């Protein structure tokens, strides 16, 4: 049905996609999985990937790598999978100085009480923050964090009971994501009818494929060969434009397709996604998104403060960063890839801009 079917690819515009949604366990059992791509689940059009449940343990089985706890929350019961963790490589005790005694005894106190929080018994009150899985028609929760809840007065359980209806009404029973829904309606999908337009679409699909498959670097032929990218590069406009050599259509068309793929990668270069190291591989390209070393070294320009100012100028300017990087890393380092790396790190929050073209960690 037209509104119950998964909108978009369940894109993360809806904020609860990034939340440990506070559902009822019975609603966990009522969820519908996303048929477009499995693994995530739906409630009232909201995409739900993670949940936070509170209840009590009423069943236990221990395996090698995980405990399995049957957790009851009045409305239903579900199995929770909890990975075990050892206190490996713990620190030795010694009659050290007061500071070392402090650190060691504090580390051991923290460890002891973390285990006291983590070790679980039947009848415990339990909280689990995790994600859903379904197998053999069973449905279960994999825990990312879990801990015993100590409550001599039942007040937190009562508060949970009182809370959940209100948050449901305020949020989860809201039947809408209400995005701008900027649907293109597949206009000009079967035929771009223009070589630059087709090149742009090829570049878009190329970056999609590249970051889908986590491609760090590639020879151009390794991307040209992709059957879907070829199924896009084979559109009628380029074929017809190549067909002038009727006696050699294969040669002209293959060369034209190589050319349009080089043009798409050139677009991605000018927009700063891919670059070439000094390696002699004329058609090998590397993607900014994956050069961890470049990130780190850029990060050492302003996490470790810029070394050249004699005054302690908090951060560094974009052009000053760029000159420092070109002198210390690569004189041919493009401004586009540097901008992309900075914006990326800021998305990570490894860097923050203070103002236009000024940055600091």
């Amino acid at each position: 049905r037209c509104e119950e079917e998964t909108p978009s690819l369940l894109w993360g515009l809806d904020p609860v996609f990034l939340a440990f949604a506070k559902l009822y366990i019975r609603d966990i059992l009522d969820m519908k999985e996303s048929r477009q791509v499995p693994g995530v689940f739906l409630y009232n059009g909201h995409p739900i990937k993670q949940v936070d449940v509170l209840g009590t343990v009423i069943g236990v089985r221990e395996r090698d790598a995980f405990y399995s706890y049957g957790v009851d929350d009045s409305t239903g019961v579900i199995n929770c999978i909890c990975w075990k963790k050892l206190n490996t490589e713990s620190v030795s005790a010694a009659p050290s100085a007061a500071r070392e005694l402090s650190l060691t005894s504090q580390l051991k106190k923290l460890q002891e009480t973390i285990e006291q929080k983590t070790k679980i018994e039947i009848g415990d009150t339990i909280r689990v923050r995790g994600s859903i899985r379904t197998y053999r028609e069973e449905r279960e929760i994999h825990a990312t964090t879990y801990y015993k809840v100590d409550d001599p007065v039942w007040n937190i359980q009562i508060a949970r009971m009182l809370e959940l209806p209100t948050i449901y009404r305020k949020v989860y029973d809201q039947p809408f994501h209400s995005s701008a829904l900027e649907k293109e309606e597949a206009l000009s999908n079967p035929g771009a009818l223009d070589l630059p337009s087709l090149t742009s679409l090829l570049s878009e699909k190329a970056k999609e494929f590249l970051m889908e498959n986590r491609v760090q670097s590639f020879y151009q032929q390794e991307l040209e060969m992709v059957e879907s990218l070829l199924s896009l590069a084979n559109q009628p406009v380029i074929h017809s434009a190549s067909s002038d050599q009727v006696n050699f259509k294969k040669d002209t068309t293959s060369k034209a397709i190589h050319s349009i793929f080089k043009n798409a990668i050139q677009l991605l270069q000018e927009k700063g996604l891919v670059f070439q190291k000094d390696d002699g591989f004329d058609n090998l390209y590397y993607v900014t998104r994956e050069d961890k070393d470049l990130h780190r070294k850029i990060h050492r320009i302003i996490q470790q403060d810029c070394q050249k100012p004699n005054h302690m100028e908090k951060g560094c300017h974009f052009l000053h960063i760029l000159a420092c990087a070109r002198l210390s890393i690569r004189p041919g380092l493009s401004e586009a890839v540097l901008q992309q790396v900075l914006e990326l790190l800021e998305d990570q929050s490894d860097i923050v801009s203070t103002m236009e073209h000024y940055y600091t960690a």
Binding site: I25, R26, T56, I58, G59, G70, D72, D73, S74, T75, G76, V77, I78, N79, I122, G123, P152, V153, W154, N155, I158, M161, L162, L164, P165, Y168
Partner: protein, 119 residues
């Protein structure tokens, strides 16, 4: 298998037999006594009323050190005995104190009211 969920019922709903005998349940009340010789007991509760009993088995699931007059939560099943009537076969039994029982009853009210409001 996972046991069927022990949904909250008030002592008056077992008193009225509204919860069917043999079904899973969770309920509350002040442990009135502690028959250890027969592992039988009562969990008295009043709600605008005189106190009414709550028979519950207690042979194994928890040899609790708590005492008479303390409040308790019990979860499991209830089943008929000819002399004893319906008696709770507890799967979990735990003590609590200082609990705002009127607010707990209101919380159950809100939960079941939302369940109603939910299609």
């Amino acid at each position: 298998m996972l046991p069927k969920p022990g949904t909250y019922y008030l002592p008056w709903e077992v008193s009225a037999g509204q919860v069917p005998d043999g079904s899973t349940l969770r309920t509350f009340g002040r442990l009135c006594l502690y028959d250890m010789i027969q592992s039988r007991v009562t969990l008295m509760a009043q709600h605008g009323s005189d106190q009414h009993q709550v028979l519950v088995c207690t042979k194994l699931v928890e040899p609790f050190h708590a005492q008479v007059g303390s409040l308790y939560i019990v979860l499991g099943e209830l089943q008929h005995q000819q002399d004893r009537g319906s008696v709770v076969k507890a799967r979990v039994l735990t003590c609590v104190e200082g609990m705002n029982l009127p607010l707990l009853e209101q919380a159950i009210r809100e939960q079941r009211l939302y369940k109603q409001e939910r299609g």
